[PDB]
Write a protein that binds this ligand. Structure first.
Ligand SMILES: CC(C)CCC(=O)N[C@@H](Cc1ccccc1)C(=O)O
Ligand SMILES: [Ca+2]
Ligand SMILES: [Ca+2]
Ligand SMILES: [Ca+2]
Ligand SMILES: [Ca+2]
Ligand SMILES: [Cl-]
Lengths: 358, 366
């Protein structure tokens, strides 16, 4: 295996792809192409680079971080020459020389072959919107493994994401402009994070392939694959309040800043605030073990019956930070029922949050 | 005690005087700021018992005198969290201090101003003014070489030395040393004092970057710095710092000069394949050439060849590459001079264009 390539052409590929052998990148030269693969057994990223300079086919594996750091550490405009010599891989550029250890390409974990069942293309921006709208509501290390991740659901012409931790839920639906089969899978949180990471903000569309046990995403000359998670993910439709009769509308940023200020004097371990809704007004209060008190009064749009209800501060701020909008609607039922929160100008996403007793 | 101040006039003072406060204040009052209204000025003070930072805020709105202490983090977060240009009205009510702005209201627990720790009065024995940039240069040139939580307590601070028309800082951890001298244009008596770790941090923190000069006062047991409307005071560390003059190699007759960035980037790349704990690289110096090598127990190898200026005898010497990189990062210059003796002796490293800063690094046993 031998190739010479500009550092420039390796930088982005290495960034995306980076048991001892799982700390190594697979390098493969074949058919005028260098392929680079990184994996952790649960997911893999493959990147390809074209090779115009003389090259020789073959494959080996090398320490991912060290190889990346060496390539990154070389000067801008550097040419990187690589040749395989037994148990070492030689890397040369200018008068900088490196010998890295290797493990055989034959030993490299190959994620089992699988079969695509559902396929579609969508804009990068749509995937970004879907993930950012809901990712914060995924569970972290819940014993219910299937909540430590994100539901991806196809229905009609929409792709939908759902995330929940049992206390709050986020759902977002976006058009993809193709009639799609009804289907849903759970992508583990680490997979969701890497999927987000591969979206660079340009116009490259994403090609998605969903199998019975895997999901794959193609963008540019990168291919990402992740295993899926087994489980009965809850139905968001059953979580949405059936008949909210009390409607508050307020400035998103005004509400966010009032919550954030009040939270300063809430209990440090379980930060919550009490809301009192009455005619044209929201009052937010907090107190702590030291008997310190905060109070915020806001002029709001509200005409239903008076009620008091508590919320976990972080759950509400998480939603308001996700909304990034002018006005927010809160749809309430009673003091012991969950609340629905939405951007007043968008029906693409909805949030449900349990009340908190204080 | 009463005052009303616009938000943005409080924020930076609050941030500044909170400098010395830790997370986990050992006792409640140490997490509080002293607020004092007197003679048309609000003063803010934070302390950790070793040093204090004080800010003076002019009061253009109606006020009443008095003093209390309140939780620093809560009070700052409240002020920061209010809308831009918010008028922050404060009224003391015994065990509580009330804060109001628009329709936002807050009640904070207080502790008596009379219990707030107050550094003893002391007497200045030397005073001088210097540009903020000069103090910045002095600290940045040497701070990285200070020890971290060493049982030899004096090493955890920074020596400040006045001598003739020069102010000098020195830092060392026993393995490597940094010294920087700068001119002040005022003839100073000889003083040598150790500023504690957090004190060095605060001195740096208070340099706004503008043209407000720094006024320094040093006593036998304290140091004080005045910048704008801030006054920083620290107790000095009670120890005898090593003399840097005795640590500088006596006659290194082997001189190497090379570009700083090329040397840095080569050391940085070589470091990748050095031992993860010991970080050893080897330097082979020969006529007009430096070869840097690293290897690790994975029997991986790095080699960097650099054109340098060197006329001395060939020699091989090992170094902790982190120590070398730290120096090169601190020098931030075009060319560097390395002054060598032998493979069992320290190297002296300097900007090739200025002797104002010098660095002494002990070699590694190969
Ligand atoms: C977010 C919260 C208001 C959902 C409460 C709820 O409807 N829980 C159901 C479904 C569910 C939702 C989220 C996680 C797990 C289960 C249950 O406990 O069975
Ligand atoms: Ca090329
Ligand atoms: Ca991977
Ligand atoms: Ca459905
Ligand atoms: Ca104002
Ligand atoms: Cl003011």
């Amino acid at each position: 295996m031998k190739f010479t390539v500009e550092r420039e052409h390796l930088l982005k590929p290495l960034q995306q792809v980076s048991l001892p052998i799982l700390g190594n990148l697979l390098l493969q030269v074949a058919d005028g192409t260098l392929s680079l693969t990184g994996t952790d057994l649960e997911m893999e990223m493959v990147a390809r680079v074209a090779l115009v300079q003389p090259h020789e086919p073959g494959a080996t594996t090398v320490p991912a971080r060290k190889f990346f750091d060496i390539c990154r550490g070389l000067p801008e405009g550097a040419e990187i020459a690589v040749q395989l010599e037994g148990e070492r891989m030689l890397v040369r550029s200018g008068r900088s020389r490196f010998s890295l250890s290797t493990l055989p390409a034959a030993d490299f974990p190959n994620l089992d072959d699988w079969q695509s069942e559902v396929e579609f293309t969508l804009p990068q921006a749509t995937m970004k919107r879907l993930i950012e709208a809901t990712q914060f509501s995924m569970a972290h290390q819940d014993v219910r493994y299937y909540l430590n991740g994100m539901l991806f659901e196809t229905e009609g012409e929409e792709l939908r994401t759902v995330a929940t931790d049992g206390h709050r839920l986020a759902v977002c639906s976006m058009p993809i402009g193709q009639s799609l089969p009804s289907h849903s899978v759970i992508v583990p949180r680490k997979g969701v994070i890497e999927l987000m990471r591969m979206l660079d903000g340009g116009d490259n569309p994403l090609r998605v392939q969903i199998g019975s046990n895997n999901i794959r995403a193609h963008v540019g000359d990168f291919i990402f694959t992740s295993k899926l998670v087994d489980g009965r993910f809850p139905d968001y439709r059953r979580v949405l309040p059936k008949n909210p009769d009390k409607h508050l509308e307020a400035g998103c940023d005004l509400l966010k800043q009032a919550f954030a200020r009040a939270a300063i004097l809430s209990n440090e371990k379980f930060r919550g605030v009490r809301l009192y809704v009455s005619e044209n007004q929201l009052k937010i209060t907090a107190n702590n073990p030291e008997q310190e008190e905060a109070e915020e009064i806001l002029d709001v749009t509200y005409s239903g019956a008076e009620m008091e209800i508590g919320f976990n501060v972080s759950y509400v701020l998480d939603v308001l930070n996700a909304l990034k909008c002018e006005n927010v609607r809160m749809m309430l039922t009673d003091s012991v029922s969950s609340v629905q929160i939405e951007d007043a100008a968008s029906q693409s996403a909805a949030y449900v949050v349990m009340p908190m007793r204080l």
